[PDB]
């Protein structure tokens, strides 16, 4: 981890299963998505892209 220009630390962090990051809201009622084609396939692609994103970071 590049904590600072002057200092860095080795880390081990779990990317799967998804960490329970709290991410708490109620504003989802106010704009809720049209799932095309279907919700579950979209969610799998998001999870796969998200893992690739964390590895690249």
């Amino acid at each position: 981890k590049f904590i600072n220009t002057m200092s860095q630390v080795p880390t081990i962090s779990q990317l799967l299963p998804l960490p329970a990051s709290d991410d708490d809201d109620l504003k989802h009622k106010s704009w809720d998505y049209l799932y095309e084609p279907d919700p579950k396939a979209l969610l799998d692609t998001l999870l796969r892209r998200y893992v690739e994103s964390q590895v690249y970071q």
Binding site: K29, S30, W31, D32, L34
Partner: protein, 75 residues
Amino acid sequence: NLNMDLLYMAAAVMMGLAAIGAAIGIGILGGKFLEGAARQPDLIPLLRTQFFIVMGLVDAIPMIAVGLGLYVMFA
């Protein structure tokens, strides 16, 4: 004579079909209104306004057949 009942039944058929047109027309209009609400409750106070205009037309023809059915009962 029997012709007095057949002119009454003429009101009965005018009423019968016109009631199905207005009931299901309003019901399909209303069913999609609930799909708009199901996604997005903040829209529903807007959506009640536009619903009532569109529902107004759905009545416009059946209400003519309703009134003539009332008149043909009395006359």
